[PDB]
Amino acid sequence: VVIDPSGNTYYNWLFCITLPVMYNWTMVIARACFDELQSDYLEYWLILDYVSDIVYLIDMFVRTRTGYLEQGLLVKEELKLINKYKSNLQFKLDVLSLIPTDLLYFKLGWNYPEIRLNRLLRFSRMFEFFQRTETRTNYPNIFRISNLVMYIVIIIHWNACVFYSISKAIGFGNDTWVYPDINDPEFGRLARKYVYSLYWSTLTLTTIGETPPPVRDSEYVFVVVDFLIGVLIFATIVGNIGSMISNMNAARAEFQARIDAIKQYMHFRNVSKDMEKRVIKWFDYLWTNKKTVDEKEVLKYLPDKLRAEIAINVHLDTLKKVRIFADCEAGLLVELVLKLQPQVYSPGDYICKKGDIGREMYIIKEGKLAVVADDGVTQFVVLSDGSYFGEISILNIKGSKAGNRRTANIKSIGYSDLFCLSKDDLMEALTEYPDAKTMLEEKGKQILMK
Amino acid sequence: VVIDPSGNTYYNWLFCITLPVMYNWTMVIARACFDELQSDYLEYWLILDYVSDIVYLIDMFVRTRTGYLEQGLLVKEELKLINKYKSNLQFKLDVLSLIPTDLLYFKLGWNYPEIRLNRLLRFSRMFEFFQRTETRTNYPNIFRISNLVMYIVIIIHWNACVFYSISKAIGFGNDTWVYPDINDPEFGRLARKYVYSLYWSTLTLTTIGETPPPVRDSEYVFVVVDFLIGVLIFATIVGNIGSMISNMNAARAEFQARIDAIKQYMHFRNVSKDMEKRVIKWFDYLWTNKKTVDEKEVLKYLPDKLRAEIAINVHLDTLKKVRIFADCEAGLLVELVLKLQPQVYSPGDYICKKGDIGREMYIIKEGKLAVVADDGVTQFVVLSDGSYFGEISILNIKGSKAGNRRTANIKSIGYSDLFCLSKDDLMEALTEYPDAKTMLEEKGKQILMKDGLL
Amino acid sequence: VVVIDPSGNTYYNWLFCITLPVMYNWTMVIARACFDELQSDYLEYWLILDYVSDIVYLIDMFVRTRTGYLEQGLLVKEELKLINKYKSNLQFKLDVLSLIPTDLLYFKLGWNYPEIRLNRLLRFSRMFEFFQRTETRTNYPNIFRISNLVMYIVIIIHWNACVFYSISKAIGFGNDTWVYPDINDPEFGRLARKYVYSLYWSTLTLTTIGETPPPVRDSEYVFVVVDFLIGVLIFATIVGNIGSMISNMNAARAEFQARIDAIKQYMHFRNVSKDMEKRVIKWFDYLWTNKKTVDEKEVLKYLPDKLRAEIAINVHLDTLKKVRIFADCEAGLLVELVLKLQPQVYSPGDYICKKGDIGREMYIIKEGKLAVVADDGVTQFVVLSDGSYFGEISILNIKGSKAGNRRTANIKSIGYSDLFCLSKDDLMEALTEYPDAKTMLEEKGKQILMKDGLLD
Amino acid sequence: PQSIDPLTNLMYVLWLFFVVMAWNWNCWLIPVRWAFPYQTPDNIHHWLLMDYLCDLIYFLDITVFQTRLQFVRGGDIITDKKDMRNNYLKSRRFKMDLLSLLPLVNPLLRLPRCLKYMAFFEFNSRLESILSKAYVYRVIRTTAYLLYSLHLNSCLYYWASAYQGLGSTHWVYDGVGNSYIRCYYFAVKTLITIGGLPDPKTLFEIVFQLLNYFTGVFAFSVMIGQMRDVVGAATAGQTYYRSCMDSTVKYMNFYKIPKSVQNRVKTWYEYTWHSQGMLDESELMVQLPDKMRLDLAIDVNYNIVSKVALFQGCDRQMIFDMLKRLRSVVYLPNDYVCKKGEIGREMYIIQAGQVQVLGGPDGKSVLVTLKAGSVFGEISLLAVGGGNRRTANVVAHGFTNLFILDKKDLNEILVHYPESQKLLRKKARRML
């Protein structure tokens, strides 16, 4: 079996191996610095560390079983997978991470968990999982702030452990700056030790202060360096949140910039107030119903195959309901679907007038149109979604008395979304289909007779 | 010999001269404000100052030997380089940097290292190096973080020296705000002096406070000004780090904006759920394998000559392997390479089915294309990278039995990267090559006769 | 009537000259209102400065009546129309309210109350105008933006210092630990100590720094909470403005590095060779080092046809007139051809054209030196310096030429070369409006070929 | 009004403000009444009355105002009462209003009433749409959130003090003063990470202070990032204009352009930025829908272009295409729109400013002055190429804005319309 890295099984294993990596990255230094934490729950640490080592071994097996892309295809040969895993630095990192340094537990005793710090060398795996999460989650900003919170909490936890270790090296309660005497019943509680160390670390690593001033020179140096790290950390939090705020509001900021630009244009051009109100209502409607993005610019990022398939899935049935395209070759229909151009109209907008040159076929997608009697107060017929007009005028039919010109005035009753196929687009598609061109000419002739 | 400013040797010298400039910018003010630092290690300071001045002299000599681009060529004339350096303000700055103010030690005394403050005027040389490192390092964010940290460290160290000097002028221990009495066994130590001054400066310049409140009017004024400066420093740090963070995920933010716009379109158009899943998986494939940026816009940034060279280096051999273009002129091949258009296909995608219009020539850059039957489960032949099909179709050959139609079904087994040469692009390139167009048509006619067609 | 042009330097100088009394009012009026000793001790100086500020305010109203505005692209010079334009503006109302003679209320209130001059603060907009005009005139926009932001925060801090001193006065000096101490103290009774300690308190609060004596009363608690909230807004404004400025300065490097990274990703993606990758990286290092990253088409795209034409003329007209075929062409045709020149940059060793390539464009050397080399490229026949040109016959498309728009020479860039290409299509498009000049160009090319013997 | 538009009705947005005020009362007073002892049995009637008023506003919102809201179906305004009611009932906003409306004396039992936040977002959107320069309000809105967080923080602190007893330690609230401004002061010193408070002693106090400071770091970061986004969005256009002008100035400085041409370019940049607020209007035009772009071009230039005698009797769509191909060009004062003897290839439509036609002996004589709305040089459009030369010098009196249509765009339009093309050729051969 070969695990697809883009599959859900790979992401599930990413989480399943991230749990021991996070457990190591926090609790190894937590037990190394807080001796009471290691001593009190030593059996639990032994079970959890053995389980984490087993999951590390299974992670190496997964990496041997993880496929990769060559020639656009997932490599499923076992020997190639082994060679690809062993060639990378990650194999060396995994081997160094699973070096049996726990044997020093028999030498240095049960109070030295820092020998397991090599397990932290699985760190990249952890990062990979979160990277995949930022590609997979439907709430990228919530996950991003959670990721930042967790990384800041991990760094604060590490600095809390460092502060406790420095206090231990100097001496508990030897001065006012260090953690106080742990022989005291209140200060000697493990919960009190860890929580006050975390409080000190959070305060110093966020430019808050509110901690006893350092007394010794090494304490002054450590406080200075850790406040510099805290300035960096606070600036990192502020920059991450500011980038998040900019990114969430980027689409709204762009739409608002377009709003302000068009408003300034109609102020500067002395555009009539009714037209101004129509433009503002049009933009508000496009934003409210999530339509303001131009379809060509959105779809241009897609490849031609996916864009063509989406265009087919949107337009193929509607274009096949057209009576001039009722019985056509599939490729011609696909090309004509690709040649469709989106148009939008406000309520009261005139798509075409009588006497206008007709060079486009309009097909209604999400609107209502009306045929008016040159006055606009009466409507002959309302054309609903899926209807079309101008299918004859795009065909160059000889002997047509009403050809090349529009015979009816088409008014947009509301906000109508149409798709237009120009005559030039039809001819460009028909140069590759001569038989379809002749059939279209004959169909238009037969329609014009009746 | 003339040093190329864009070369490796110039950058190595930039580091070699930045070291004395950083040494001056820290230790000159450190020894000026902390008198015990100057007096206790006076021989070491004199040796290091002489070394720094020697490296400054070699820096001026390097300025005389640093070529500049005139008419796109490095000027290698000695007098021209000397005159170009002398006309610049940097020559005046370097001359002012190396004024022999060390003689004034005989007047002021050994306790006045401010006379070497003019060496700080070599700062331009320092900043340039970091700018060059910002263009040279593989990790721009790591180096820019380190550069910002180093600037903040020097600013805090300078403010620490200023605080200690203000305490010296007011009087050590004269009130609670200043540095305490230096006759104390603990606070009289030079290490304690510097670490407490640095701690005070870190507290004040990082908007924390927690220093003893001022007593005198001058101390209150200096505290106001220095907390305002620290607010500016913190805002600058936050602005630089936030600009870095925005620049890191700007590509990710743009990709997510494109994905969100596509998703909004698909929810608008009621596109089928399977098609939406295919599009999302495709964009995840683009992000995972670092194929997000389109080739067209990326190649637009390059100049026409450099873009042509990139296109040649990518496509020239695989275009020359095509049998119609094998015996063709080099310029036509270059034009046709520049006409090649990138197409990427998902696994299970169809390049063309039977009955489709063949108006472009597909060349497999990477991936495997299967020739499948009508059912699509039986495979005739698999074409690897460098293979091509539809070369006859792009030639408008009279008498062809299969006119602009596909005789085979071509399926993408995996994610196939390929380049299409349309008939219109081939004709547009051939408009300047009439003999090559005639030869291409004759070769295509010969191939059609050889393969039983026509 | 004499009309001051708002875009002129005289208007900017007067903006400075009116900004000085506006700043003086905005600081010192509240300073003297809150610090009683400051008003009482320097009363003659304050009266003289207030009279000077009022005189400058009257002259500012006169300048506003004499300041023209652009209507239909013309500076209005009619005195009645300028007066009506000023009066219809709200600024006339604010200037009248700022010059209301409230200084007579001294005789009703004594010299203890300069708050009557607070209406002078309604000239504030003039101050703002000067600064924004400075932001359009200075060569250091970011340095000036930093200075303007700092000055605004210093004024707000000074105002909050005055407010804190007034609140301590209302509660009572020395009544509790939060207020300013008792003013009968020899150290804290000094006016300099009063203002400077109030400024210290205000800086600490408005920067959200703290380390001040905690409030003891509910009114003090309310004021401290509200003033730290104002400080939150101030601090967020400072950091946001500086971050926006930093992003603005780094935007050009950000987009250049993003383009470089995208190109590097493309070369790793398409497996481009290592030497070609090194050439591209060296090219972009050359671009960033020499400040040549700007695209001339993108830089000049917004400019109108006449201004882009003038710039292009000043860049290219002499060297295009030095061309033999374009020597006798009409001036308008020369303008169009110069506007159709497209910049090309070649690295050292780059071949602009080789023997046997199709010649569709004419290259004019703006900077750099090119070499006519043989097939091997080692030897050089002649070096073309800046202002030289080649390929003038190829763009003409002369019938009967043995070359037939094909290069007869190998042109190699010895160093970095900035050339400007005039394509055959662009030449013909420019010649559409000049048929006689097109015929003259064709005749010139034909005669050149006859002299060279290339025509048959 | 039998049917009310949720977008453009001022009475509706006033009612939205009323619903927002009721929601704000719930959100700001549920934690106060839960934490602080301000909900005494002596003054319980005020709390009950205002809660009843807020619930009544909620009920009138869910029943009266929301069911009369017109909506958009298929791009059509739908005011049919049954359809309006069904659209409201099917909506998630009705579900949120029902979830808030259910009751569930304890102040925390009113916590469902805080779920009517969609009214707040709708009112925010209406406020952003109504008033220009909206980011200022956004700042206030962001500040409001900060205040609310401090409010919540304040209440939490009091509960913590009430969980430990008032005055039991130095960390908890002592018990003197208003008891809300003290806890709000603690919330300000903590949630802004100012500090200076009495240090926590017990484990509960240290945990509370740690979590409070952490939330304060992130809330302060949110405030700073919001203000940074506000500043960056407010000055984005000014930054873009300054960057374009600086890029142009750098270009002219590299090529040693003299001070006269550089000053003219800077003058054009400044005048364009101050007059139309954007460097190029076609960049905005291409972003619009084609119908909107067409109707704007009609509203700007159609009467003037149809007043021209040259295009009388021509096809209306060809007129519309010429309107779409018009380009706005700003000429500096004393600039030559037409030079005597130069090729006439452009149609000039004076949108703003004045244009002087020169003539007479030795030049410098104003034959005629053309104001805005006047068209000259249209005869040059109907030329074969080189067949038209400008007869008189034509100069710009001030900064004049002209809408220009050149001969190339007219020909590109004319190949589409054979009738108008034939009519224009007929007029061209008729006038000579």
From Swiss-Prot, chain A:
Annotated segments matching region Cyclic nucleotide-binding domain: 330-450
Stated family: Belongs to the cyclic nucleotide-gated cation channel (TC 1.A.1.5) family. CNGA1 subfamily.
Superkingdom of origin: Eukaryota
Keyword Cytoplasm on entry: no
UniProt protein name: Cyclic nucleotide-gated channel alpha-1
Cytoplasmic side of membrane: 68-92, 136-142, 250-450
Residues annotated for 3',5'-cyclic GMP binding in this entry: 390, 393, 406-407
Sorted UniProt keywords: Calcium, Calcium channel, Calcium transport, cAMP, cAMP-binding, Cell membrane, cGMP, cGMP-binding, Coiled coil, Disease variant, Glycoprotein, Ion channel, Ion transport, Ligand-gated ion channel, Membrane, Nucleotide-binding, Retinitis pigmentosa, Sensory transduction, Sodium, Sodium channel, Sodium transport, Transmembrane, Transmembrane helix, Transport, Vision
Full protein segment contained here: 152 to 601 of 686
Region (Ion conduction pathway): 140-248
Subunit structure: Forms heterotetrameric channels composed of CNGA1 and CNGB1 subunits with 3:1 stoichiometry. May also form cyclic nucleotide-activated homotetrameric channels, that are efficiently activated by saturating cGMP, but poorly activated by saturating cAMP compared to the heterotetramer with CNGB1. The channel binds Ca(2+)-bound CALM1 via CaM1 and CaM2 regions of the CNGB1 subunit; this interaction modulates the affinity of the channel for cNMPs in response to intracellular Ca(2+) levels.
Reaction(s) this enzyme catalyzes, per UniProt: Ca(2+)(in) = Ca(2+)(out); Na(+)(in) = Na(+)(out); K(+)(in) = K(+)(out); NH4(+)(in) = NH4(+)(out)
Curated annotation (Swiss-Prot), chain D:
Site (Occludes the pore below the central gate): 228
Impact noted for substituting residue 110 to C: In RP45; likely pathogenic
Region (Ion conduction pathway): 134-233
Compartment(s) of residence: Cell membrane; Cell projection, Cilium membrane
Effect in UniProt of substituting residue 196 to E: Increases the affinity to Ca(2+) ions. Does not affect heterotetrameric channel assembly
Residues that hold 3',5'-cyclic GMP according to the record: 377-378, 380, 390-391
Site (Central gate): 220, 224
Membrane topology (Extracellular): 35-43, 157-179
Domain of life of the source: Eukaryota
Binding-site positions, 3',5'-cyclic AMP: 390
UniProt topological domain (Cytoplasmic) ranges: 66-80, 122-133
Cysteines engaged in disulfide bonds, as pairs: none
Region C-linker: start-end pairs: 236-312
Transmembrane segments: 13-34, 44-65, 81-100, 109-121, 134-156, 180-206, 207-232
Region (Cyclic nucleotide-binding domain): 316-432
Record-stated family: Belongs to the cyclic nucleotide-gated cation channel (TC 1.A.1.5) family. CNGB1 subfamily.
Described function: Pore-forming subunit of the rod cyclic nucleotide-gated channel. Mediates rod photoresponses at dim light converting transient changes in intracellular cGMP levels into electrical signals. In the dark, cGMP levels are high and keep the channel open enabling a steady inward current carried by Na(+) and Ca(2+) ions that leads to membrane depolarization and neurotransmitter release from synaptic terminals.
Implicated disorder: Retinitis pigmentosa 45: A retinal dystrophy belonging to the group of pigmentary retinopathies. Retinitis pigmentosa is characterized by retinal pigment deposits visible on fundus examination and primary loss of rod photoreceptor cells followed by secondary loss of cone photoreceptors. Patients typically have night vision blindness and loss of midperipheral visual field. As their condition progresses, they lose their far peripheral visual field and eventually central vision as well.
Comment, domains: The cyclic nucleotide-binding domain (CNBD) comprises three helices and a beta-roll of eight beta-strands from CNGA1 and CNGB1 subunits. Upon cNMP binding transmits the conformational changes to the C-linker domain of the S6 helix to open the ion conduction pathway. The ion conduction pathway consists of S5, S6 and pore helices from CNGA1 and CNGB1 subunits. It contains a central hydrophobic gate that opens upon cNMP binding. CNGB1 displays an additional charged arginine gate below the central gate to regulate ion permeation.
Subunit (UniProt): The rod cyclic nucleotide-gated channel is a heterotetramer composed of CNGA1 and CNGB1 subunits with 3:1 stoichiometry. CNGA1:CNGB1 channel binds Ca(2+)-bound CALM1 via CaM1 and CaM2 regions of the CNGB1 subunit; this interaction modulates the affinity of the channel for cNMPs in response to intracellular Ca(2+) levels. The olfactory cyclic nucleotide-gated channel is a heterotetramer composed of CNGA2, CNGA4 and CNGB1 subunits with 2:1:1 stoichiometry.
Name of the protein described by the UniProt record: Cyclic nucleotide-gated channel beta-1
Annotated organism of origin: Homo sapiens (Human)
Parent-protein residues present: 645 to 1084 of 1251
